Amino acid sequence: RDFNNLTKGLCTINSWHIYGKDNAVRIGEDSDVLVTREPYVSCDPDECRFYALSQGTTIRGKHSNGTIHDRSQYRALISWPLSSPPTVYNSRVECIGWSSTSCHDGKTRMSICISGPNNNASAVIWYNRRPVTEINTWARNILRTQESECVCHNGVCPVVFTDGSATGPAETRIYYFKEGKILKWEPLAGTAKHIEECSCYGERAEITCTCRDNWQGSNRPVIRIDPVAMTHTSQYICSPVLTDNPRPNDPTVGKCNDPYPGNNNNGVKGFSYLDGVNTWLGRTISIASRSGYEMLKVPNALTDDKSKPTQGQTIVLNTDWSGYSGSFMDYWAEGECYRACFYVELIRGRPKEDKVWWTSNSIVSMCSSTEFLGQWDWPDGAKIEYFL
Amino acid sequence: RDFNNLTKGLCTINSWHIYGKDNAVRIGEDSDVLVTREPYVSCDPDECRFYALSQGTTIRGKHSNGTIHDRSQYRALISWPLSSPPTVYNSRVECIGWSSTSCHDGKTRMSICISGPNNNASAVIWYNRRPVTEINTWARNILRTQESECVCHNGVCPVVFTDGSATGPAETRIYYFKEGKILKWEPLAGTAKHIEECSCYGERAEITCTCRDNWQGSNRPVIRIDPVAMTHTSQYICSPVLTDNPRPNDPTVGKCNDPYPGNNNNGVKGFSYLDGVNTWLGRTISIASRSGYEMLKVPNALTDDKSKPTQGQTIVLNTDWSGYSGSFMDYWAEGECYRACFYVELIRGRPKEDKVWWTSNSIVSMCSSTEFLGQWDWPDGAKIEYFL
Amino acid sequence: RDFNNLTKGLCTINSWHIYGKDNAVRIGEDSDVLVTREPYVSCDPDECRFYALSQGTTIRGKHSNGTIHDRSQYRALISWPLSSPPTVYNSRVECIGWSSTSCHDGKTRMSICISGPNNNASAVIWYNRRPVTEINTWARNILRTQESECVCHNGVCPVVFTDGSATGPAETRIYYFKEGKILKWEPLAGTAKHIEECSCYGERAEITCTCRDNWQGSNRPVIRIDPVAMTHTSQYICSPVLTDNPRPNDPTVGKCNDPYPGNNNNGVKGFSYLDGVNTWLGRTISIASRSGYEMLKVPNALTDDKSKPTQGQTIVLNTDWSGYSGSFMDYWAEGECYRACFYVELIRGRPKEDKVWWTSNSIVSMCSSTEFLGQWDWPDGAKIEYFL
Amino acid sequence: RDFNNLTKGLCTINSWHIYGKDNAVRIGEDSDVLVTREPYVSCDPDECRFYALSQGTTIRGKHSNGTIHDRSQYRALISWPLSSPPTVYNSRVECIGWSSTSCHDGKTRMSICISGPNNNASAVIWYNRRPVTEINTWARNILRTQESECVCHNGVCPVVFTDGSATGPAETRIYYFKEGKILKWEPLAGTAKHIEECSCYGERAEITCTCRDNWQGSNRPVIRIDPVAMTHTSQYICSPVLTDNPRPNDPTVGKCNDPYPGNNNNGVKGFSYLDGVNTWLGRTISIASRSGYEMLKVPNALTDDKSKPTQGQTIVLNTDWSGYSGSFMDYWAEGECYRACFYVELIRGRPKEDKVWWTSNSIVSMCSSTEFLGQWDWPDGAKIEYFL
Ligand SMILES: *[C@@H]1O[C@H](CO)[C@@H](O[C@@H]2O[C@H](CO)[C@@H](O[C@@H]3O[C@H](CO)[C@@H](O)[C@H](O[C@H]4O[C@H](CO)[C@@H](O)[C@H](O)[C@@H]4O[C@H]4O[C@H](CO)[C@@H](O)[C@H](O)[C@@H]4O[C@H]4O[C@H](CO)[C@@H](O)[C@H](O)[C@@H]4O)[C@@H]3O)[C@H](O)[C@H]2NC(C)=O)[C@H](O)[C@H]1NC(C)=O
Ligand SMILES: *[C@@H]1O[C@H](CO)[C@@H](O[C@@H]2O[C@H](CO)[C@@H](O[C@@H]3O[C@H](CO)[C@@H](O)[C@H](O[C@H]4O[C@H](CO)[C@@H](O)[C@H](O)[C@@H]4O[C@H]4O[C@H](CO)[C@@H](O)[C@H](O)[C@@H]4O[C@H]4O[C@H](CO)[C@@H](O)[C@H](O)[C@@H]4O)[C@@H]3O)[C@H](O)[C@H]2NC(C)=O)[C@H](O)[C@H]1NC(C)=O
Ligand SMILES: *[C@@H]1O[C@H](CO)[C@@H](O[C@@H]2O[C@H](CO)[C@@H](O[C@@H]3O[C@H](CO)[C@@H](O)[C@H](O[C@H]4O[C@H](CO)[C@@H](O)[C@H](O)[C@@H]4O[C@H]4O[C@H](CO)[C@@H](O)[C@H](O)[C@@H]4O[C@H]4O[C@H](CO)[C@@H](O)[C@H](O)[C@@H]4O)[C@@H]3O)[C@H](O)[C@H]2NC(C)=O)[C@H](O)[C@H]1NC(C)=O
Ligand SMILES: *[C@@H]1O[C@H](CO)[C@@H](O[C@@H]2O[C@H](CO)[C@@H](O[C@@H]3O[C@H](CO)[C@@H](O)[C@H](O[C@H]4O[C@H](CO)[C@@H](O)[C@H](O)[C@@H]4O[C@H]4O[C@H](CO)[C@@H](O)[C@H](O)[C@@H]4O[C@H]4O[C@H](CO)[C@@H](O)[C@H](O)[C@@H]4O)[C@@H]3O)[C@H](O)[C@H]2NC(C)=O)[C@H](O)[C@H]1NC(C)=O
Ligand SMILES: CCCN(C)C(=O)[C@@H]1OC(C(=O)O)=C[C@H](NC(=N)N)[C@H]1NC(C)=O
Ligand SMILES: CCCN(C)C(=O)[C@@H]1OC(C(=O)O)=C[C@H](NC(=N)N)[C@H]1NC(C)=O
Ligand SMILES: CCCN(C)C(=O)[C@@H]1OC(C(=O)O)=C[C@H](NC(=N)N)[C@H]1NC(C)=O
Ligand SMILES: CCCN(C)C(=O)[C@@H]1OC(C(=O)O)=C[C@H](NC(=N)N)[C@H]1NC(C)=O
Ligand SMILES: *[C@@H]1O[C@H](CO)[C@@H](O)[C@H](O)[C@H]1NC(C)=O
Ligand SMILES: *[C@@H]1O[C@H](CO)[C@@H](O)[C@H](O)[C@H]1NC(C)=O
Ligand SMILES: *[C@@H]1O[C@H](CO)[C@@H](O)[C@H](O)[C@H]1NC(C)=O
Ligand SMILES: *[C@@H]1O[C@H](CO)[C@@H](O)[C@H](O)[C@H]1NC(C)=O
Ligand SMILES: *[C@@H]1O[C@H](CO)[C@@H](O)[C@H](O)[C@H]1NC(C)=O
Ligand SMILES: *[C@@H]1O[C@H](CO)[C@@H](O)[C@H](O)[C@H]1NC(C)=O
Ligand SMILES: *[C@@H]1O[C@H](CO)[C@@H](O)[C@H](O)[C@H]1NC(C)=O
Ligand SMILES: [Ca+2]
Ligand SMILES: [Ca+2]
Ligand SMILES: [Ca+2]
Ligand SMILES: [Ca+2]
């Protein structure tokens, strides 16, 4: 009908309830399930769907061998019904590429896929299921994007790309699209030293993205965007509760405008809901690997450099694998406020489970509740020994 | 369009005709069919569908091993087209949980799934396919619900939950929801000593649920609910024709307000249509196990403590397995009255058939006819030896 | 929108062009295809679909063993998209039963399935996908019907049932339904001695059914029905070109009101388009078995007892199997006249091909052309040796 | 709504971006994928889809043996969602035949399938999913058509057929259809000596088809059609950059009205966008086999007999197989101009890869960009050794 506008604020988050889970690897052991990675969730005004980058093969298929590799000509952005597994028969391809983002603006959906050689990649923007705009690589080093949904406000959907080095300063830009066309683009500003895979959400006409500094920060950079004035700024989450991975152990005081040193040249896509005292951070439990996952309420994490957890909820136990995690919300749900949600990718296979030759994942997603619900852990659930 | 109101009464039930059958286990022997249990049927104004709690694996899949267990993080409430099997490709997930109920109010459908640890479970109410309300456990002992459809009247859909002990007094409540929100909740009243898995139907603005006393009753408790005044009352079916399982042999006189003693700490979900002389009870044939199934016309069973069968119809022979059974009706069918219907879960696998390591079921459902139709038996039809 | 009325007459039939073919057995050798038999084709105002009675198992499944048997509790009437195979995932169940018919009246579709023991079977009429009317057996000997589509005119859809002996006089009735309700029913009249599996079509407000005399006739009975006056009459096709199977060799003169003697207690469902000089008969090529299939233009076959073929078209070669065949037409196609069509069931497996333990079929269907198109044969195409 | 009119001209083509890729053979190694060949892409006003001629079997199925053969009764024109593989469950059959074409006129789609013996084949035209017109063979030697989409303008959709010898003069006609009916037909005119498998597109009320001279030309014939005046003319592409296959090496000067001699009795379907300086030709890289594929900008190729490439883009590397290629465009995309697109069939199996007994293909399709995007190669991606 009309373009969606971010007119509400977040609901109070007192706990998290189970929203969706696809059990993809359990089911894929004996069904035509596609091998995937880099999943996310994204809503249209009438349906919320699961998304991920397919590897172009089923788990049990012979071509599943080698799917640890990130970029090839056989990947494509696919969507499928919420909580169903990504099967060969119920999956809709959105576009061809090894990096992506997608969001509905209220009228229709925009999907962006990037494909190509490391030095000659290009993004092709789709709007209403047709290619509209194309952007060629500017730094010649793996043009890449969010890997989770973008957000729009009155037709304008900012998207964050990064092109260049994974472990140095790189060239990051914020494009503002309206109906698949580019309205403008900015170089990254503020104090964030490196930006990768931003996880964004929107409330009260402002857009917040919690990204990943793959270079030196163990604390996460934040990009606040103003979709009306088409400007932005960046900093790091101040709190000592570090949320990247691998990372150092939490100190007693954090940094607001510089990476917290410790681990270099690595990370994991993650997110956070930053809302004053109503602030929750997500992080792997393990500081060493992508294992376990928990949510922690850390009031004023963004600005308070001594902020520590006041509440928590375990999502995945530290004995179970996790992986990418990002935010999304149903901007079209009835209600006075926007209910915060997030997904967690549960990686199975390589590199950790070397007994199999493939790498895939399933998804678990939760949304907030104003109640103080009891908690449960949500592991992938597949038994690797059944695949040998 | 508008909220449905229960304005009609039941049609005269002179016999039962075959409505739907999915042959799930026969077909699943060589198709990607999901392992399920606790099925039911429920109609929308334009389509009637099959529902059940998936186990998150196919029958032939390796993860089918162990599916006798009731609660895990891999179950989800799924729906699929009438008479089709619950396959990985044609099943729609309604919500994540190991206990559930669902009903259409005329405008849209409400689904409720419960998940969690035995001591920290929570119900999340979905309305129009979005989470709306959440309820945390009140007795810390397996918050659970109906396992068959709820019923609505003018926007209000009462639902019966029970939390606490399976074999003692427990805390049972009747919530009245309207558009996914709670309007009110009551503690159970009347003479019923224990309530579990209520099977409900509605006629002439009153809602009747035949439940299960897992503690000491072999006769079934009944909860009559008034969706307008939002009140209720409870008693037991008076008739000596006992319908729980396992149960004693029928006496010559039954009890109206106390459990009929005999078997303790066990039962099976069942239903009954209680309508004066137009009253039919469903029960397993076997008093010892979930085997066979028959319908018996027992005039005034609810109130007449000496009422005995005047007519009958065998559904499943006593040599074939049965299981849960419950009521539903197409409140949107053309007609002067509501046609009574019911489904019977046909369990295959463990505990009875120990040759396989899984537990699943198929479904048979019938609706009433005013004719006196000939009868036939409707077994599951799968040959277990093909699965070894 | 509104009830369809048979206002046109047949188009001139100068040849037959290929309409649909599903290649079900070729494809089912390595896909989840349902075992079927007794197929037909039937159109809705916006789509034409394939129909058949499923056996409740896939061809490759273990339960495919034994599917030569006609009546069991595992059969159901299913429909699927034109030219697709009847797969477990794209098939819609219309109703449960081992005998059936179905037709769209312009507003919605009526489907009738019969199920039960040989001596206590019952038909349940569905209209707009809900059960509406039920009819119990009247002769206690396998209540059965057409096995191909019925036809409607202004809301009234006559259907021919037969109950009783397969090899003697039996009790045949013509019901006239309107919106799933019975308007009236007649005993069979005229000279036809036995009626089974009528294949009907309609033109210029009259309905013609070519049926099967399983008792003694090798010539086919015809039932002409008047859907307005709700009356009918019956006779036999006069022509010496015999179309039942098994049958004697063609004589030089046929019979108009008595069965042509020769073979007893056997037959095959077939059809014919009877339209003066524009008359075409379909028959197996083999007089001994269900093998081969051809269409022959025999002017005035219905009334001319010495009528012989003036033109012909081979459909299936006599080295390939055939089986049931029946008529249908798209009453909603644009045009000045109704284009005659028909389908042929191509049976594979038992009884003829005893190397496998199953019995199934694929379908070939053609429609008329006013052109004189070249001909081709359309065999099933599966290689049985691949199934051993 | 209303008939589409070709009111725009081509967009400037500075490079090609990835549009769709199905990875059919990789995925089909372990999924129910149909064996196909002769694919193409075609858009409706609201969705663009993949099309191809099925072989009536899955790749892994036993009937896949022998699918190198072109014409049989088991082929059918099928369509499926863009970028999905052609699976048994998500494929819609358009018509039965071993040669075809299809296009949407703005109101609905017309599909034409040809089937039959080599000497008695016939085309049956479908419009709005119903058979409408039929055309019998005129030369008695494999009546055949485009094998890619036709184009319409104000209800009129010209289609090019050829009947007769594959290696001599044959009888080629241009039919002009409107709503499935024939408005007129012409014999081929102009200087083209042989016409086969025309690839057409439309801009500014003119229709251009680049076909294949299987007889003696290594340069491609072009048919320009005027859908309003219903007339046409033919010539050959003047450029020395030869685009058929197998072909001689490029000379320094080409021919405008005579086949360029070199290779006889062979070729491959291909296409070209002929637009003054905005002209791009597609060709296999290998002059000897269907291997590799590239696009070359050759300004004024149609008329300039000395025109050579000024720019290029590799699509498939010469070490990877290619095959048929053709044009299509989304005539219903928003925009000031029509974005040129094309597909390339990537054949796997026989004749080149004799280790397997089947022949199938996957598809890669691109559309133009006004940007100068980086290039990447897009091979089929399947590893044949996994199929042994
Ligand atoms: C029914 O459900 C209810 C509701 O869920 C249950 O109640 C909830 O119970 C939760 C579990 O106790 C509780 O969460 C906890 O809340 C406290 C604040 O009150 C919070 O501090 C906890 O988080 C710390 O501890 C967990 C491990 O237990 C860590 O994994 C977590 O990271 C937090 O500690 C780490 O960081 C801190 C800050 O830097 C450090 O001070 C601390 O040392 C620790 O650091 C080490 O570990 C880090 C992680 O590996 C590492 O990076 C670092 O380097 C150090 O090595 C936790 O969130 C909920 O608040 C509570 N909610 C409510 C409403 O009651 C109840 O149990 C259930 N009922 C039953 C019967 O079970
Ligand atoms: C064509 O179709 C028609 C229509 O279906 C067929 O006619 C129908 O035939 C039905 C079968 O006879 C008939 O049902 C019976 O109706 C009588 C009343 O007339 C009813 O009492 C029967 O039910 C008792 O018997 C069955 C076993 O036969 C039991 O399984 C059932 O539970 C009932 O008995 C038990 O409970 C009673 C009450 O307490 C006791 O008095 C009795 O002893 C027995 O108790 C023992 O068994 C219990 C169950 O295991 C156990 O818990 C307890 O502890 C005791 O051990 C039955 O419903 C239909 O009424 C009839 N309908 C019509 C319209 O005619 C016809 O056969 C078909 N045609 C052909 C040719 O076959
Ligand atoms: C390109 O396509 C065109 C168009 O299709 C081709 O032309 C068509 O060619 C058809 C084949 O010749 C032709 O059909 C024939 O038409 C004649 C009438 O002209 C018709 O009589 C033929 O039917 C008889 O013969 C076939 C076998 O050839 C039998 O199977 C059939 O049953 C008919 O004969 C049987 O019944 C008759 C009547 O009772 C008897 O007189 C006769 O003896 C025979 O009886 C025995 O066989 C019966 C069947 O088994 C059995 O029950 C009985 O007891 C006896 O044993 C046939 O229909 C088309 O008319 C013609 N159409 C046109 C427009 O031209 C052309 O070939 C193709 N082009 C090329 C190059 O091939
Ligand atoms: C990032 O991406 C950009 C954009 O893609 C890359 O830049 C592009 O790079 C392309 C590759 O160089 C370039 O294409 C080339 O453009 C030239 C014109 O400038 C064109 O002539 C080239 O085509 C000839 O060469 C290729 C092989 O290299 C042949 O396969 C092709 O057929 C053309 O040559 C053949 O035909 C000619 C005309 O007849 C003959 O003169 C020539 O001898 C040759 O003939 C033989 O081969 C034929 C084919 O087998 C055979 O039939 C015949 O008989 C003879 O045997 C090619 O298209 C793009 O123009 C360029 N685009 C832009 C915007 O820059 C860049 O590399 C990427 N970045 C990085 C870091 O890699
Ligand atoms: C490129 C350097 C930093 N970066 C963002 C990564 O390397 C990410 O790593 C991971 C990862 O799991 O850590 C997967 C991503 N894979 C993927 N999106 N296909 C990949 N991104 C790209 C574009 O390949
Ligand atoms: C909890 C005590 C009484 N009760 C209602 C049961 O135990 C029921 O038993 C059975 C059963 O088959 O008897 C299955 C139900 N399983 C299930 N719904 N997943 C289960 N309910 C729950 C919540 O687990
Ligand atoms: C009953 C006597 C005559 N008759 C019509 C038949 O026996 C038919 O035979 C055949 C047959 O192939 O000849 C299949 C039909 N099978 C079927 N419709 N399932 C069957 N009809 C019924 C009702 O079982
Ligand atoms: C008939 C002579 C020229 N010609 C156009 C061909 O032979 C084409 O060859 C090829 C081919 O791959 O070269 C496949 C086509 N196969 C196919 N469309 N099924 C076939 N056409 C027909 C009608 O069979
Ligand atoms: C968003 O705001 C714009 C004006 O600022 C308005 O035109 C549009 O309709 C609004 N969207 C909705 C969904 O109301
Ligand atoms: C149910 O009753 C309410 C008023 O009591 C009415 O507004 C509503 O429209 C009724 N529902 C239908 C389907 O008529
Ligand atoms: C199923 O699981 C049990 C316990 O996990 C194991 O002993 C048994 O062998 C398994 N059954 C099969 C067929 O693998
Ligand atoms: C069929 O005829 C009836 C009246 O005899 C008419 O009301 C109806 O609309 C007609 N059907 C159509 C499709 O015109
Ligand atoms: C099919 O069933 C029969 C009888 O039930 C049995 O003898 C036969 O071996 C079975 N065929 C196969 C392949 O199992
Ligand atoms: C195409 O042109 C015809 C008149 O020449 C017009 O009637 C039709 O509406 C036009 N199509 C569109 C889509 O405007
Ligand atoms: C395929 O068919 C040929 C000839 O029909 C046969 O020789 C060959 O062995 C078959 N290939 C396979 C794998 O069966
Ligand atoms: Ca980092
Ligand atoms: Ca009990
Ligand atoms: Ca007979
Ligand atoms: Ca050539």
Query: Edge-to-edge strand order for the sheet containing C231-236?
Result: C196-203, C206-212, C221-226, C231-236
> Is A21 within 8 Å of B116 when comparing Cβ atoms?
no
HEC profile of A285-307:
CCCCCCEEEEEEECCCCCCCCCC
Residue A238 burial by CB count (10 A; 0-12/13-18/19+): exposed, middle or buried?
Answer: buried
- Rounded Cα gap, residues C290 and C283, in angstroms: 9
Sign of CA dihedral A206, A209, A210, A215: negative
Provide the resolution (angstroms).
2.0
CA-CA-CA-CA dihedral for D135, D139, D142, D147, to nearest 10: -60
Q: How far is C-alpha B229 from the geometric centre of its chain's CA atoms?
A: 25
Q: For residue C207, how far is its CA from the centre of ligand 18 (angstroms)? A: 22
- Rounded Cα gap, residues D103 and D326, in angstroms: 14
Residue B187 burial by CB count (10 A; 0-12/13-18/19+): exposed, middle or buried?
Answer: exposed
Helices (H), chain A: 24-28
Q: In angstroms, what separates the C-alpha of D120 from chain C's closest C-alpha?
A: 5
> Is D339 within 8 Å of A131 when comparing Cβ atoms?
yes
Token readout for C121 is: 């079977």
- Rounded Cα gap, residues C33 and D56, in angstroms: 13
> Is D381 within 8 Å of A136 when comparing Cβ atoms?
no
Token readout for C60 is: 């490759």
Q: D135 to each of B6, C364, D101, D290, how far by Cα in Å?
A: 60, 21, 14, 33
> Partners for A (CB, 8 Å, 3+ pairs)?
B, D
In 10 A of CB B195, how many CB atoms?
24
**Cis bond upstream, residue D246 (ω within 30):** yes
Query: Edge-to-edge strand order for the sheet containing D15-21?
Result: D15-21, D359-369, D341-349, D325-328
Nearest ligand, CA of residue D195? 8
Whether the CB of D348 is below 8 Å from some CB of chain A: the reply is no
Q: What angle do CA B170, B175, B177 make, to 5 degrees?
A: 160
Q: Are B368 and B339 in contact (CB under 8 A)?
A: yes
Q: For residue D351, how far is its CA from the centre of ligand 8 (angstroms)? A: 14
What domains can you pick out in chain B, each with its CATH number?
1-388 (2.120.10.10)
Strands (E), C230-340: 231-236, 272-273, 280-283, 291-297, 311-321, 325-328
- Rounded Cα gap, residues A132 and D367, in angstroms: 11
- Rounded Cα gap, residues B53 and B93, in angstroms: 9
In 10 A of CB C119, how many CB atoms?
12
Q: Are C93 and C80 in contact (CB under 8 A)?
A: no
- Rounded Cα gap, residues D21 and A72, in angstroms: 12
Element (H, E) at C210: strand C206-212
Q: How far is C-alpha D131 from the geometric centre of its chain's CA atoms?
A: 23
- Rounded Cα gap, residues A76 and A85, in angstroms: 16
Element (H, E) at C182: strand C181-187
CA-CA-CA-CA dihedral for B193, B198, B202, B204, to nearest 10: 0
- Rounded Cα gap, residues B24 and B27, in angstroms: 5
In 10 A of CB A189, how many CB atoms?
13
Spatial neighbors of B47 by CB under 8 A, at least 6 apart, are B81, B82, C129
- Look at strands B341-349 and B359-369 and give their pairing: antiparallel
Looking at residue D33, the DSSP 8-state letter turns out to be B
Whether the CB of C383 is below 8 Å from some CB of chain D: the reply is yes
User: Which of C34, C63, C140, C142 is the best substitution to test chain B (most B C-beta atoms within 10 A)?
Assistant: C63
* Residue the block writes with tokens 């659970």: B144
- Rounded Cα gap, residues A60 and A386, in angstroms: 11
List, in sequence order, every residue forming a beta bridge with A388; answer none if it has no partner: none
Phi then psi dihedrals of residue B386, to 5 deg: -75, -15
Sign of CA dihedral B331, B336, B339, B340: positive
Q: Are B95 and B126 in contact (CB under 8 A)?
A: yes
- Rounded Cα gap, residues B192 and B186, in angstroms: 15
Whether the CB of D332 is below 8 Å from some CB of chain C: the reply is no
CB-nearest to A18 from B72, B115, B120 is: B115
Tell whether ligand 3 has an atom less than 6 A from the beta carbon of residue D120: yes
In 10 A of CB D356, how many CB atoms?
18
Looking at residue B336, the DSSP 8-state letter turns out to be S
- Rounded Cα gap, residues C152 and A385, in angstroms: 60
- Rounded Cα gap, residues A121 and A135, in angstroms: 9
- Rounded Cα gap, residues A121 and D379, in angstroms: 17
Query: In chain B, what residues touch A17 (CB-CB under 8 Å)?
Result: 122, 124, 131, 134
Q: D15 to each of A182, D314, D327, D373, D376, how far by Cα in Å?
A: 19, 10, 16, 6, 12
- Rounded Cα gap, residues C318 and B98, in angstroms: 58
Q: Are D72 and C380 in contact (CB under 8 A)?
A: no
Q: Are C27 and D88 in contact (CB under 8 A)?
A: yes
Token readout for C211 is: 């049926």
Query: In chain B, what residues touch C117 (CB-CB under 8 Å)?
Result: 374, 376
Q: Are A327 and A271 in contact (CB under 8 A)?
A: yes
Query: In chain A, what residues touch B32 (CB-CB under 8 Å)?
Result: 30-32
Q: Nearest residue of C to residue B21 by CA position?
A: C96
Q: What angle do CA C264, C270, C274 make, to 5 degrees?
A: 115
Spatial neighbors of B288 by CB under 8 A, at least 6 apart, are B245, B246
Looking at residue A355, the DSSP 8-state letter turns out to be T
Element (H, E) at B314: strand B311-321
**Cis bond upstream, residue A351 (ω within 30):** yes
Q: Residue D325's closest CA among D350, D296, D347?
A: D347
* Residue the block writes with tokens 């649909």: C20
Spatial neighbors of A100 by CB under 8 A, at least 6 apart, are A38, A51, A53, A77, A94, A111, A112, A113, A114, A145, A146, A147
Q: Residue D139's closest CA among D172, D120, D176, D164?
A: D164
Element (H, E) at C28: helix C24-28
> Is A136 within 8 Å of D371 when comparing Cβ atoms?
yes
